Amino acid sequence: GSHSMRYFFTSVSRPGRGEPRFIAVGYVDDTQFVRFDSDAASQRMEPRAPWIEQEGPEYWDGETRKVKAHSQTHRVDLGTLRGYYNQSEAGSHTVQRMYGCDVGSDWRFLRGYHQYAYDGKDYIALKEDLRSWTAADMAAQTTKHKWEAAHVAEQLRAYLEGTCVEWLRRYLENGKETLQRTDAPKTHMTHHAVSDHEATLRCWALSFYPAEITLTWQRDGEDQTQDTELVETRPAGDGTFQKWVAVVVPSGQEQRYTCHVQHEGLPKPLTLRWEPSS
Amino acid sequence: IQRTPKIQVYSRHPAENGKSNFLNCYVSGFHPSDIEVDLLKNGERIEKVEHSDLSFSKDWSFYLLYYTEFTPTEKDEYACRVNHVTLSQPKIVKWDRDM
Ligand code: NA
């Protein structure tokens, strides 16, 4: 199917003493594969997936240099934006950055992105053309004029269409045994009486990968949204994901209700019905 | 921009009394990133708890997974306790194996 490579960066200023807290993570699809944490002892970019440990020491040296450079950029930006917004030196503030590329089922470039936030709100982002900038306010407009003058978008476009997609294809090949394996949802239904004449039916999807999934309830084959509840997809902690959906029904009427599961690992969508024995 | 955490407490595997498992507390949707998360057993803090590396969603809100091994029983109470700048008091969500 389609695939993505993304890097996430967070820096949080510490006005009381010292440098910002900086955390960086890299993902292929929904799999974390590298991390850097300024509070950790190594002060190196570190592996988090077996297939990236293949890479030699020149890789780990280069990635460590680049991620520390990112951390200093964030440190400088925190100071610059505090000035733009006329904020006190006493408060803590946050900068966040995300960038990456998507490729299609043919592993060819589909789109790239590069976005920046200050205190949890959009600040500046590269447009989909990878040539111009969306500035959310007049402070960001100032940054936009500087980045136009310094050819910044050109360098980001070159990376997103070149290096980013080339190494993504390299990772997809080296980590083939997991990165190109789909794990279909293991599904089952549970039944919880809520009174002597109503019950909750809960439809479970467990141990699936990637995280994208749709769970929907139908009653006599029409969609059902009244009296349903859907939890956010959540990590199992072993690299796979979990989700459930529930509906409250009159006791005795369970056979009217069907749960429908769509996922990349399923040739055909699945249909589940309560089996009158538990 | 202050956004309060959403909390889910659950097991990694379908729970069976007496069989070891992993207890998860997933906190998401919050800003700023500083947050206190404890896993509790019978009201008391479990002490070897690990957590994921901080990351964030489309709207820039943060998410973290806290986790530890545990063995469910008929007798023990498990829960997640969360404190954040947006919360007046720590929020306690009890583990229910049906959810
Ligand atoms: Na510090």
Automatic annotation (TrEMBL), chain A:
It is found in: Cell membrane; Membrane. It is a single-pass membrane protein; Single-pass type I membrane protein. Zn(2+) binds at H151, E154. The keyword Isomerase does not apply. One of its GO terms (molecular function) is metal ion binding. Residues 185-271 form the Ig-like domain. One of its GO terms (cellular component) is Golgi membrane. The keyword GTP-binding does not apply. Keywords: Disulfide bond, Glycoprotein, Immunity, Membrane, Metal-binding, MHC I, Phosphoprotein, Signal, Transmembrane, Transmembrane helix, Zinc. Disulfide bonds join C101-C164, C203-C259. One of its GO terms (biological process) is antigen processing and presentation of peptide antigen via MHC class I. Belongs to the MHC class I family. This is MHC class I antigen. It comes from Homo sapiens.
